Design a protein around this ligand. Structure first.
Ligand SMILES: OC[C@H]1O[C@H](OC[C@H]2O[C@H](O[C@]3(CO)O[C@H](CO)[C@@H](O)[C@@H]3O)[C@H](O)[C@@H](O)[C@@H]2O)[C@H](O)[C@@H](O)[C@H]1O
Ligand SMILES: [Cl-]
Length: 385
């Protein structure tokens, strides 16, 4: 009378560690087994299963998503508000994604977005982390003229740049609420190529188009390709999120990594963006409800969470977990974690995000401003009614 449950993982960089933590939990609960299910196109495979009443027992679902918000409200996930382990979460970080004042997702860690950069290279080239858009332009051009490739872009994998272009409007208007007031809660067809906002977005994106700025053959490079380039010193920087660090450390790079926040028009305006990263919610219809809380309770134990945080490094929201000094790789992208400088993903209030990813990458692969401005309105007009 052993009972198997599914945990529906969407965090791929971290599968080998999550499988280990799972074996340690099956070893201490010898009457429980746990399927770790990592599928392709998880976002969608999960959307199918949920409409079809087949929700996996524990699900890794990102807590700012519409899907979560909708499904929470339609009773698909258990109310966790009045669980004990939930007390081990801090920064009122469960309640930052409450739905009708009820918590439905334990957000263990929270991700962030920024540029990764080779510290050793930058040292060798007399170059410094940038603090204005202008300095950042001039950075990229200074690397080109010193014979090296500034950026590794994953031109097949449009999502890697979602956080970038968000941060572009974000720093461009003052923050998240303001960006969405520009893009989303404005009139239909509002977004024009002439808006000063729109002109800054394009200034910030255009940094990724500076002549000589991307690696040979980037247009078909994926995540892992770019991760390999950065790791080898083939490229000096890559815009991406805290989740990549694990994959970057795997390839055993021969230089110390830094990160930085994408900057504003002026000094001190920089931002990062992100939300719960390792974040779990429990089926309201799981056949085995007690086992599912046992898995989740386990993940909150600070000595278990340390095993995970030691491989992944995204900053964590659980009590008792030694965080790293400011000499960490992620030190500069996650400095401001859990402050009013860590915006929640803009797509919180959107109906989807694929078409945003796409139009971002398309601009970097085409350079077409009116086309991108048009594409922005084509994406947001369905939402404004
Ligand atoms: O960056 C856009 C993405 O950021 C947030 O997701 C965190 C998540 O990002 C990556 O995961 C994948 C890899 O493609 O992206 C989609 C989610 O849009 C997932 O189906 C897929 O696993 C990293 O691979 C993960 O390590 C990390 O957890 C945000 O939650 C997403 O909505 C989206 O904005
Ligand atoms: Cl989507």
């Amino acid at each position: 009378s052993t009972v198997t449950i599914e945990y529906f993982n969407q965090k791929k960089e971290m599968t080998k560690t999550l499988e280990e933590i799972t074996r340690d939990f099956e070893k201490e609960n010898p009457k429980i087994k746990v399927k770790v299910v990592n599928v392709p196109n998880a976002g969608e495979v999960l959307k199918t299963r949920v409409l079809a009443g087949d929700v996996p027992d524990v699900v890794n679902i990102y807590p700012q998503s519409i899907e979560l918000q909708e499904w929470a409200k339609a009773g698909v996930f258990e109310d966790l508000s009045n669980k004990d382990y939930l007390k081990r979460v801090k920064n009122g970080y469960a309640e930052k994604y409450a739905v009708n004042e009820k918590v439905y997702n334990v957000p263990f860690t929270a991700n962030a977005y920024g540029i990764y950069y080779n510290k050793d290279k930058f040292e060798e080239l007399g170059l410094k982390v940038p603090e204005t858009w202008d300095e950042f332009e001039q950075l990229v051009k200074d690397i080109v003229a010193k014979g090296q490739t500034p950026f590794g872009i994953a031109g097949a994998d449009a999502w890697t740049l979602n956080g970038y272009n968000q941060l572009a409007f974000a720093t461009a208007t003052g923050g998240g609420k303001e960006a969405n007031q520009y893009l989303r809660y404005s009139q239909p067809n509002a977004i024009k190529l002439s808006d000063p906002i729109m002109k800054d977005d394009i200034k910030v994106m255009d940094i990724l188009r500076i002549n000589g700025s991307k690696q040979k053959n980037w247009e078909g490079a994926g995540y892992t390709d770019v991760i390999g380039a950065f790791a080898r010193g083939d490229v000096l920087m890559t815009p991406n999120g805290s989740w990549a660090i694990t994959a970057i450390n795997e390839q055993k790079p021969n230089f110390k990594i830094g990160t930085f926040m994408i900057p504003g028009k002026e000094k001190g305006q920089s931002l990062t963006v992100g939300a719960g990263d390792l974040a779990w919610s429990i089926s309201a219809t799981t056949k085995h409800p007690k086992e599912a809380n046992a898995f989740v309770e386990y993940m909150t134990r600070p000595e278990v969470m340390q095993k995970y945080y030691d491989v992944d490094g995204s900053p964590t929201a659980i009590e008792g977990v030694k965080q790293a000094g400011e000499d960490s790789p992620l030190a500069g992208m996650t400095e401001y974690a859990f402050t009013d400088r860590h915006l929640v993903w803009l797509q919180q209030y959107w109906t989807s995000e694929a078409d945003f990813h796409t139009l971002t990458m398309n601009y970097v692969l085409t350079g077409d401003k009116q086309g991108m401005v048009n594409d922005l309105n084509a994406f947001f007009n369905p939402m404004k009614m």
